[PDB]
Amino acid sequence: ATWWNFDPRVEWLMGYLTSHRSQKVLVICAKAATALQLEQVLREREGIR
Amino acid sequence: GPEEITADIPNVGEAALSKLDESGIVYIGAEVTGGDILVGKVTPKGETQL
Amino acid sequence: TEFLKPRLVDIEQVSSTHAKVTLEPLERGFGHTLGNALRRILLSSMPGCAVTEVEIDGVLHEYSTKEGVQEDILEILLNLKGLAVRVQGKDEVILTLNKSGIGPVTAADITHDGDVEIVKPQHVICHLTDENASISMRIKVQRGRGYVPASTRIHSEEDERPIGRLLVDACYSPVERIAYNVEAARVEQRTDLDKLVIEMETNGTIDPEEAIRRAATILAEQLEAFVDLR
Amino acid sequence: GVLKIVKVYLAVKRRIQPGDKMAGRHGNKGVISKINPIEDMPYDENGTPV
Structure with missing residues (x-):
């Protein structure tokens, strides 16, 4: 279910990431499915490798 | 034996494999320039024993 | 040596885009020089x-x-x-x-x-x-x-x-079309003078007074590196 | 002998530059020679260039 479309956390993360393009960031999360879904959101919404 | 179409290509850096989905075929809309990968294929060869 | 200077005189908004700008007096031979200089620098160097x-x-x-x-x-x-x-x-x-x-x-x-x-x-x-x-x-x-x-x-x-x-x-660039015209002016006894009339057709985004002032500015700045040094 | 074949398209967008041919209907070929700023084009008595 499309839980990544109204959270504040995902929005905050994208905002932080896209203004500091010269920092390496280690994001740690809870479990595997959450990690994969975050990766998909970032890749197809802001092009952050 | 048979060929395969897959994303797990031996001896490629992770960079070129961002633009392939699970099945190993490009997205729709991604814009390519000469030299990239379109379809990931591997050809089996001889099996030596060990 | 009877040098004389121009001053921006009249602006007449025909419509919301078309506009005519008058400018006088100019001694003989100066209508065309200014006319063509700032025709060439309005069609290529305006910001929009x-x-x-x-x-x-x-x-x-x-x-x-x-x-x-x-x-x-x-x-x-x-x-x-x-x-x-x-x-x-x-x-x-x-x-x-x-x-x-x-x-x-x-x-x-x-x-x-x-x-x-x-x-x-x-x-x-x-x-x-x-x-x-x-x-x-x-x-x-x-x-x-x-x-x-x-x-x-x-x-x-x-x-x-x-x-x-x-x-x-x-x-x-906002300016679309531009065409100038030199005419004979009237001052008390000097029949030698002229006047310049520039007609300007653009979309919005530029009020003509500002356009002519920016053109004159960049021309003078270009000449500055051409007076002092040698 | 074939198992499956994929097939991928591409789409470019070409535009004018020197060297590139044109021609009228009456048989007068030609090959573009220069692309000239707006100012330099001859302009008739009313402002509109050619």
């Missing part, structure tokens, strides 16, 4: 704003079609190339468009920010031909001068953009 990236949801590349929209997306891009905005404070803005229902979608209903002035609010963008259809877009507007295509910008930039940003060619 134009649309440069468009993001429309549910669309991946610029060759598809959409549910219940008359134009296919190439036509929407070629209609957006030519809207005229006026930006007061920033140098880049993001505007938002959002509409639903049968009818033409015009430029009037861009959800205006506080400091963006849209010149003609009756310029058509799309046509919606079904009661359930809706459309929502995010435009970006920048500032610059000259002509800048999309190929140059894509090859210069190293930044990565997602699948769904569409790049548009930019055409920043």
Whole structure:
């Protein structure tokens, strides 16, 4: 279910990431499915490798 | 034996494999320039024993 | 040595675009020199704003079609190339468009920010031909001068953009047509003088007084490195 | 002998530059030689260039 479309956390993360393009960031999360879904959101919404 | 179409290509850096989905075929809309990968294929060869 | 100087005299707004600017007195042989110098530097070096990236949801590349929209997306891009905005404070803005229902979608209903002035609010963008259809877009507007295509910008930039940003060619300069004219003036006993009349046709975004002042400024600045040094 | 074949399209957009041919209907070929700023074009008595 499309839980990544109204959270504040995902929005905050994208905002932080896209203004500091010269920092390496280690994001740690809870479990595997959450990690994969975050990766998909970032890749197809802001092009952050 | 048979060929395969897959994303797990031996001896490629992770960079070129961002633009392939699970099945190993490009997205729709991604814009390519000469030299990239379109379809990931591997050809089996001889099996030596060990 | 009877040198004499010009002063900007009369401005007569024929319409919201056309405008005529008078300028006198000029001694003989100076009508043409100034006329052609600033004709050449108004058609190439004025600053203005134009649309440069468009993001429309549910669309991946610029060759598809959409549910219940008359134009296919190439036509929407070629209609957006030519809207005229006026930006007061920033140098880049993001505007938002959002509409639903049968009818033409015009430029009037861009959800205006506080400091963006849209010149003609009756310029058509799309046509919606079904009661359930809706459309929502995010435009970006920048500032610059000259002509800048999309190929140059894509090859210069190293930044990565997602699948769904569409790049548009930019055409920043606001002045469209310009033509001058030299006529004979009347001063008490000097029958030797002249007058210059420049007629100027542009969209909005430039009030003519400011245009002529910017032209004169850059000409004098160019001559400065040409007087003092040798 | 074939199992499955994929098939991928591409789409470019070409435009005018020097060297590129044009011609009228009556048989007068030609090859573009220069792309000239707006100012330099001869302009008639009213402002509109050629």
